[PDB]
Design a protein around this ligand. Structure first.
Ligand SMILES: Nc1ncnc2c1ncn2[C@@H]1O[C@H](COP(=O)(O)OP(=O)(O)OP(=O)(O)O)[C@@H](O)[C@H]1O
Ligand SMILES: Nc1ncnc2c1ncn2[C@@H]1O[C@H](COP(=O)(O)OP(=O)(O)OP(=O)(O)O)[C@@H](O)[C@H]1O
Ligand SMILES: [Mg+2]
Ligand SMILES: [Mg+2]
Ligand SMILES: [Mg+2]
Ligand SMILES: [Mg+2]
Lengths: 329, 327
């Protein structure tokens, strides 16, 4: 038998396009005798189709309508062709989705309704990590540092009185740097909030961290975790598209700290399967949390892969391991 | 035209039976002129069926298999009969599910995908309220009092040294009192925890709060919220308990109960509705119990009782929740 694996991609998200790239990379790294892939692509209009494989513009490729069903008796997909339907039972879903509705908890809700095993984090962990201000809330409770931040929903005024520049303004729930601006003067503040609301009605205001931006790639369920090599940001497209150095030029102590911290958060946040912890390392040598990326970019240029690979885990290894982790109980 | 409102009930949850009762109540109260309902029962085994309506063993009568589709082009149901299928567009979904898969973000997950509007709390607040320990995390930040709690997952050893008795052991994510115990002695502790793991691998341990058990029903989107009369558990879970409405408390205790309940709903980003359970210590202070995101709606339920006391008919409550979904 092969394992029929469901590979979802695309999605009604600002990161749709990256998603396609990540799914395209996945597809080239599932070896021959093991998987029988089903490429479920969600269009930017939220339409579901089963296609020949991710890439562009696969919508214009051979495409059958179909959906992941929430019915357990199906434990898979319905294929919808002109009034007639078929059912394909999957063994496992791999949700290669970034951003809104993908790392939100949205698809992890439909999945849990399916009872089908899946890769990556929970509804909970996904919710906690997409709202950066809940992540900070959790990280603090585990004794982990975080920016100093304020939160502003549609109904609240911005607390300018209280602010010390420079400042980072961001949607509370976005990624790949959509909506993020760096304000330095009061007057440039309202516009920044505005831009950020194009992406979330709830807006985050952060007091700027000084330090090097470090990134750690985590894998595992529960307590048993491994990390990749620690990366470092060197020298509008978000971090994942940034020039990095691997491994980061930092103390061996610094490195373990960075890693232990990443795992400590991953654990506190209840993460599962994988995540990419983003961190700050100040000159005093102390560590601050940025973000927890629960289903990080997996593109040929993405950070997490680069990080696992440098630690001796091939892309096919990572997928192998994520797969077994998803079926782990 | 009537309003196509899909009414989902049942669910693969310990609270299945209570959801069917809640659906049966709602069903009596959507009057003849406005709604054209669609009763989507999810069986105890997780099968999805369109039936004649909630209650008894609905699973016995006339159910056609169908699912709510995550596909935005459909904006409703697909009906699966004989290898053939039809699509029914929905204006709105009312998810009358309680507990696991119904208050924990799973159903809203499918919903959020589908683009259809829906009654009640979103994925993020549903999750934050399902896990009682997360609820406390949030509440404390909002400057609201909670119990002294500890948490234990299968890997971790319960911290016997820290604890003080009495103490309460409970699934971190459950309701209707499934798996809740009041442990007396260290000896009886391990048994409870196993009791509660019948329901959730992460277990929650609380130091016992002392005071009147006070309930508050909330309604609204954003900051513009209203409340029912405050209820009090006259001294098989909470919802089924002997209660008194309104609670026999000071006018100021009352203003503070509502104010507190509303502030928590705000802080947790609740929407549509929620029932907030509280503790009123003899000192006049208030400590959080639980936020129930889509509480019992049965004839004997607390939320309904609280709202009709404030002059909102069960029909009035359905009507409001709906517009609130479409706002
Ligand atoms: N508080 C802060 N202090 C210093 N720099 C910040 C702060 N917040 C954001 N930044 C900077 O701007 C970027 C903001 O992206 P952040 O990770 O916060 O949100 P994001 O949308 O998840 O972006 P990404 O997914 O690409 O990491 C960071 O990479 C960092 O360069
Ligand atoms: N820390 C505590 N101190 C005192 N009593 C508690 C404590 N925790 C729980 N209880 C009591 O035991 C029951 C626990 O129910 P709790 O709200 O904790 O979980 P639940 O399963 O959601 O119950 P329900 O949804 O029916 O309210 C409550 O009725 C309350 O009386
Ligand atoms: Mg991100
Ligand atoms: Mg980042
Ligand atoms: Mg409950
Ligand atoms: Mg309660």
């Amino acid at each position: 038998s092969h394992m029929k694996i469901g590979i979802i991609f695309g999605g009604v998200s600002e990161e749709h396009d990256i998603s396609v790239k990540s799914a395209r990379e996945v597809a080239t790294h599932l070896g021959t005798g093991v998987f029988e892939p089903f490429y479920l692509g969600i269009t930017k209009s939220g339409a579901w189709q089963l296609c020949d494989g991710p890439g562009e513009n696969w919508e214009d490729g051979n495409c059958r309508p179909a959906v992941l069903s929430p019915d357990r008796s199906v434990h898979g997909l319905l294929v919808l062709e002109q009034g007639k339907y078929e059912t394909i039972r999957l063994d496992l879903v791999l949700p290669v989705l970034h951003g809104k509705l993908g790392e939100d908890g949205a698809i992890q809700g439909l999945l849990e309704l399916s009872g089908i095993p899946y890769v990556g984090c929970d509804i909970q962990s996904s919710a906690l990590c997409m709202d950066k201000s809940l992540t900070y809330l959790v990280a603090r409770s585990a004794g982990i540092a975080t920016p100093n931040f304020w939160t502003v929903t549609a109904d609240e005024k911005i607390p300018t009185d209280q602010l010390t520049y420079p400042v980072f303004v961001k949607p509370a729930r976005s990624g790949s740097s959509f909506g993020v601006s760096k304000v330095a003067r009061e007057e440039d503040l309202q516009g920044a909030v505005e831009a950020a609301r194009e992406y979330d009605s709830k807006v985050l205001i952060e007091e700027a961290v000084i330090g090097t931006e470090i990134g750690c790639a985590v894998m595992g369920n529960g307590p048993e975790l491994i990390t990749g090599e620690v990366d470092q940001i060197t020298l509008e497209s978000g971090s994942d598209n940034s020039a990095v150095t691997v491994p980061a030029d930092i103390s061996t102590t610094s490195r373990s700290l960075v890693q232990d911290t990443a795992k400590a958060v991953y654990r506190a946040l209840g993460c599962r399967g994988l995540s990419r912890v983003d961190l700050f390392l100040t000159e005093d040598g102390k560590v601050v949390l940025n973000e927890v990326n629960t289903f990080p970019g997996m593109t040929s240029y993405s950070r997490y892969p680069r990080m696992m690979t440098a630690a001796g885990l091939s892309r096919a290894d990572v997928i192998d391991r994520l797969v077994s982790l998803a079926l782990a109980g």
